[PDB]
Amino acid sequence: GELFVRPKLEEIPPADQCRGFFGPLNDSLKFLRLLDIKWMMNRAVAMRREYLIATPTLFTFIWMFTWKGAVIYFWGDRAPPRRMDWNTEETGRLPLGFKPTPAPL
């Protein structure tokens, strides 16, 4: 809609103010910020870096709507059957008495 202006360094709230799934991950819990997805989302929104949430989604949709959708449909592996036809590992070997051609030299 309207033009977007990146926030200044002084307009960005501190990391400690961000909230996670349950509560802020302040001192003694900072390393949990890496694992909390909601805390990261809230931090990105606070830092005006909302694209980090939106860009991966849309692209993913495109990737499914364009290339992976048909790949799955035409080449995807369906559910296995109850009675499975495993490989006996007997096919392929040359017969006894066969004289293979020499390798290049």
């Binding site: 033009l3 977007f4 990146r6």
Partner: protein, 227 residues
Amino acid sequence: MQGSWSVLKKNCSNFFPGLLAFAQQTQEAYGIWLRIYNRQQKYGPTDFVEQSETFSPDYHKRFHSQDKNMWVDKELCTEVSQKEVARLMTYKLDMWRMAHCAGALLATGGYAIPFGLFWLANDTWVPSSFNLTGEELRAWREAQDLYRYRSAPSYLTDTKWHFDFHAYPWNETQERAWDDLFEKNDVRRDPKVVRPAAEMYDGFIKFELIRRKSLRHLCRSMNIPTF
């Protein structure tokens, strides 16, 4: 200019001497550019040396800024002469075209040979070094001028039409400058009358916001390869 058999013969005859002259010019221009680049890195402003980023206000796409990323070395005469600068500019043009041709050759292996035959049949994209006589140089300059004639009107029309369709000047002097800027060469344009158009267009579009199609037209008009 259209290709011809005479120009093909001319360029084929002068191919290897042209390459040798281009190599010599390459060495000389590398020396000149080394001097200039050292001077820029040593005495250049902090923004110019650090390559400050200027982003567009709509899509935040970086492009060179005229004020920050362009710097005039007022004291360059001590290290580099005017003739050396002109030589460097000419070599830059020739090297650009030669680099594009070499890239095509490397990409397509030996399949670029017929395209090379097309290339040597026209003086539009051959280096100036391929001309060993005055008449050949005159023909080459004629071809370059023909390309400039072919390309420039499109760029001028693009600029004028976009501005006039999406904006109008603020005051009468700006109106006069804008109208007189795009007059034909058969009449003489007064630079003092025309200058305010620069500020008006800075208000409309700067060099940092130049569109890609307009850039393509400009590069065509400057004999700069675009593909």
